[PDB]
Design a protein around this ligand. Structure first.
Ligand code: HEC
Ligand code: MSS
Lengths: 81, 373
């Protein structure tokens, strides 16, 4: 038989917020990687940092995210993280 | 009972337990990225397999591998393409061994100021191991490298979750690939590679940052041009100057691929706020570089106003951690301890940290405040 490897369960979750971008981030930002990538970034980086992170995902890594959702997500992140 | 906090902002991390591993600092789960607790580096010069750090870029890592069916393909600008089993590698080629540091490009990124995006690591994204395997030079010689060859590309079993994401492929120059030190490792600390460290086979590139050390390595292509894949052309770029640095907030005007390690040193047996007995205080730690040899390690107990020469431990190889020891007289009270290494070509560590947009290559003189009583 082949050898196999068992990963533990993923538990990482995004910080809830009343902004619509929270749900848009839930729906768009966990498809390629766990959201601990977001949770662990430097804190209080602000608007330009998170705008750039979101644009990189879409333009460089081809995340299927529309313009409206992209703004919502980047705004939710900049306010929350 | 299951978290730590690294000494930079937003430093909380779970302690997580993976098969074959002791608890490690969980950075990301998918893909798994795991940092080594700093205390491990005081436990011995060779990092145990169960403690060794883990970094990946893409969620689609292999989780089932039949070692019998596994093949390493050698192709492109060669006379004879090869399909090699692990048994072929172990039996048909002589073996080589090297004790060598693997260190992430962004090891220590969390300490960079201003903070930059990416893997927020403390200093535990490095480790030292006795690697055993086949020199790449030997396998390429068997294939027969063709004149006009310029680079070799390296790809593994992992893959993007969404096919449009650039697959993880790296490149070395042909002269580098055939130098005899670049190794196709099938063994780590006398055992088959741990799964997350690239079972059953990985590239080892002594003295070079870890991005080149492709894991689960199954595809080697000799090419007659410069490779322009995303992870060479766009990612892993450093400022094209001596300090590999820019003014904080400024983009470099020209870049090149990241390459050899710069010189680093750490004191391992004390951490911030540790208590020591005033008098002769024993200090120990490690130093390493890109393979030129550590010439000296100097130690200071007065924040760099004066230096004492440490005694270097017997070496394990030019690519290994080099141990050192020093006994310093400490007066009662606070002391800022530092160590600073230099190598045989005159490379050293800066007293003040430099910066670059990606937060690669940090090697500032490490300071540690202790209390003598
Ligand atoms: C696949 C198309 C992705 C989608 C969907 C999202 N991201 Fe992503 N992200 C992707 C990759 C291949 C990587 C690098 C992984 C590595 O270990 O190198 C990342 C990384 C991040 C990071 C880390 C910082 C950085 O490298 O820029 C962050 C903060 C991040 N991703 C955030 C993020 C958000 C907000 C997303 C929704 C718009 C999102 N990611 C989606 C690929 C993909
Ligand atoms: N295949 C593969 N390989 C690979 C990868 C991925 O992702 N994939 N990563 C890198 C990196 S990035 Mo930075 O530069 S560091 C690093 C390394 C690590 O190793 P370990 O995990 O074994 O420790 O690996 C290397 N290799």
């Amino acid at each position: 038989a082949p050898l196999t490897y068992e990963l533990p369960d993923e538990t990482a979750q995004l910080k809830p917020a009343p902004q619509p971008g929270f749900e848009a981030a839930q729906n768009n930002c966990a498809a390629c990687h766990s959201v601990d990538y977001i949770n662990t970034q430097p804190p209080g980086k602000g608007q330009a940092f998170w705008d750039a992170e979101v644009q990189k995902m879409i333009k460089v890594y081809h995340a299927p995210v529309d313009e409206a959702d992209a703004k919502a997500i980047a705004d939710y992140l900049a306010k929350t993280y | 009972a299951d978290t730590v906090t690294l000494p930079f902002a937003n430093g909380e991390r779970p302690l997580v337990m993976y098969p074959g591993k002791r608890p490690l600092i969980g950075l990301t789960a998918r893909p798994p990225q795991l940092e080594t607790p700093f205390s491990v580096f005081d436990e011995g010069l060779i990092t145990p397999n169960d403690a060794f750090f883990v970094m990946y870029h893409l969620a689609g890592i292999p989780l089932e591998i039949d070692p019998d069916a596994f093949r390493l393909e050698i192709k492109g600008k060669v006379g004879t393409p090869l399909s090699l089993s692990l048994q072929d590698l172990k039996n048909d080629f002589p073996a080589s061994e090297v004790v060598a540091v693997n260190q992430c490009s962004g090891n220590s990124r969390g300490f960079v100021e201003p903070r930059v995006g990416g893997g927020q690591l403390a200093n535990g994204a490095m480790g030292n191991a006795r690697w055993r395997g086949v020199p790449l030079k030997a396998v390429l010689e068997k294939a027969g490298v063709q004149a006009g060859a310029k680079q070799v590309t390296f790809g593994g079993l992992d893959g993007p979750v969404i096919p449009e994401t650039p697959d993880f492929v790296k490149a070395l120059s042909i002269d580098h690939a055939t130098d005899g030190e670049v190794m196709l490792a099938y063994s780590m600390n006398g055992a088959d590679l741990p799964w997350l460290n690239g079972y059953p086979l990985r590239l080892v590139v002594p003295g070079y940052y870890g991005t080149y050390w492709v894991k689960h390595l199954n595809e080697i292509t000799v090419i007659d041009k410069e490779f322009d894949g995303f992870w060479m052309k766009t990612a892993y770029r450093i400022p094209d100057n001596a300090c590999a640095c820019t003014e904080p907030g400024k983009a470099p005007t020209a870049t090149i691929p990241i390459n050899r390690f710069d010189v680093r040193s750490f004191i391992t047996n004390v951490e911030n706020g540790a208590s020591v007995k005033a008098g002769e205080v024993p200090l120990r730690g490690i130093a390493f570089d890109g393979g030129y040899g550590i010439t000296q390690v100097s130690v200071s107990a007065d924040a760099g106003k004066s230096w004492t020469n440490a005694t270097l431990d017997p070496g394990l190889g030019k690519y290994s951690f080099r141990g050192w020891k020093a006994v310093l007289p400490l007066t009662k009270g606070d002391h800022v301890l530092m160590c600073r290494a230099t190598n045989a070509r005159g490379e050293t560590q800066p007293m003040q940290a430099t910066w670059n947009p990606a937060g690669y290559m940090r090697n500032v003189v490490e300071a540690t405040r202790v209390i003598a009583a």
